[PDB]
Amino acid sequence: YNPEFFLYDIFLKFCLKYIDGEICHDLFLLLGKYNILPYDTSNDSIYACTNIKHLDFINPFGVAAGFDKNGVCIDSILKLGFSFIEIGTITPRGQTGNAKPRIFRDVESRSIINSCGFNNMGCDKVTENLILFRKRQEEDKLLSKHIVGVSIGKNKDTVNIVDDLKYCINKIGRYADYIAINVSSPNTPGLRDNQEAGKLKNIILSVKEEIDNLEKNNIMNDEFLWFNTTKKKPLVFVKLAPDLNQEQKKEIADVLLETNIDGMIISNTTTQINDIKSFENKKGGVSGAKLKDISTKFICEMYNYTNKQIPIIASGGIFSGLDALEKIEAGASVCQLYSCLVFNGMKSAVQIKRELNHLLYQRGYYNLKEAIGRK
């Protein structure tokens, strides 16, 4: 539909075959930094407009965390045709992450394994970048109504987790539309994180208190306090890992209901996949198609464990419009992509939005919001 997407798709096969994955990522980010990526300025289907409570997404596809970990590429990625982006995961202080090489691709299974280790330049710098973005958003029509969430985590060496989360809120909170709590990374030596119910409940409540406190202590109206899209206080989501037993899943669902979390992103990568030939000697968590079915099941479980009272953000192995519908019919309200962009390139959003629209009419739905859990 656009002559510009195609050139990047041509060079994609070469890069995927010959260039280190992280080098591919750095080059992609540099291209987007200089505003020479393609665009998708078509109007979206009003019947595919989705929402998470009062958060209104123009379409149901965003970019998952870990893509623009530092918010240096926000405009260009969004203008590819996504309704929202999740930057991060960020930590208060910068971190270089694990030793390179740390990202390896298996083209045949369209899978990736990564052991990045929360490499980022730190909250202060990323906050400055998001401020620059919000100022550009005021003057750029192609960014109006677009949503930016911030994924937050902990530095590798931090003793307590709530402290790091509170600092990020107190610096970047008034510029974020939503906050994603990452307690699911496989690349922190503390195996994943304190997803135990007691710790998680206290963590969530502390975050909500810090958000509420930014509001209280100010003289300006809410319009000028929240320099975001909504002009409203940020929502709270949680990012979950797939390597959990049923008791843990049930316990966290009970905690989410008690603490009134605004959403749950299910899920992050898994370290339990052992049938990828090229990754057998590679450390890290695996992303892509091989996580699809696993994550879909997790959606069904939590959607049921939470009595359909907690909205679901789907992440894992989404490549096609059918994949998205599987997530939606399982209980998800919105979808995030990552591996798809690695293997399909610039055309990811346009293709998947068109695919889902066609499938959505075929199955007879008036709109996709009616389809959540409809199977």
Ligand X SMILES: CCn1cc(C2CC2)c2c(CN3CCC4(CCC4)CC3)n(C)nc2c1=O
361 is annotated as contributing to ligand binding: no
Catalytic residue among 45, 76, 111, 185: 185
CB of 354 to ligand X, least distance (A): 20
Nearest to 286 by CA among 136, 151, 103, 145: 103
Strand partners, 90: 152
Q: What is the DSSP letter of 158?
A: -
The item of ligand X, ligand OG6, ligand FMN, none sharing an interface with residue 117, based on CB under 5 to 8 Å by kind, is ligand OG6
Question: Is residue 283 involved in binding ligand X (CB under 6 A)?
Answer: no
| One-letter amino acid of 257 | L
CB of 232 to ligand X, least distance (A): 31
Residue 293 host element (H or E): helix 292-305
Question: Is residue 12 involved in binding ligand X (CB under 6 A)?
Answer: yes
Q: What is the 3-state secondary structure (H, E, C) of 11-51?
A: HHHHHHHHCCHHHHHHHHHHHHHCCCCCCCCCCCCCCCCEE
Rounded Cα distance between 279 and 112, Å, is 9
Question: Is residue 288 involved in binding ligand OG6 (CB under 6 A)?
Answer: no
The item of ligand X, ligand OG6, ligand FMN, none sharing an interface with residue 12, based on CB under 5 to 8 Å by kind, is ligand X
Question: Is residue 184 involved in binding ligand OG6 (CB under 6 A)?
Answer: yes
Question: Is residue 315 involved in binding ligand OG6 (CB under 6 A)?
Answer: no
Rounded Cα distance between 268 and 259, Å, is 22
Other C-beta atoms closer than 10 Å to the C-beta of 364 total 6
Question: Is residue 155 involved in binding ligand FMN (CB under 6 A)?
Answer: no
Question: Is residue 242 involved in binding ligand OG6 (CB under 6 A)?
Answer: no
Cis peptide before 60 (omega within 30 of 0): no
Question: Is residue 285 involved in binding ligand OG6 (CB under 6 A)?
Answer: yes
Instruction: Read off φ and ψ for residue 148, nearest 5 degrees.
Output: -125, 115
Nearer of residues 173 and 284 to ligand FMN, judged by Cβ = 284
Instruction: Read off φ and ψ for residue 338, nearest 5 degrees.
Output: -150, -70
Indicate if 333 belongs to the active site. Answer: no
Q: Which residues are the active-site residues?
A: 185
Q: Which residues bind ligand FMN (CB under 6 A)?
A: 64-66, 69, 88-89, 103, 112, 114, 116, 151, 182, 239, 268-269, 287-288, 291, 315-318, 337-340
What residues form the annotated binding site for FMN?
65-69, 89, 182, 239, 287-288, 315-317, 338-339
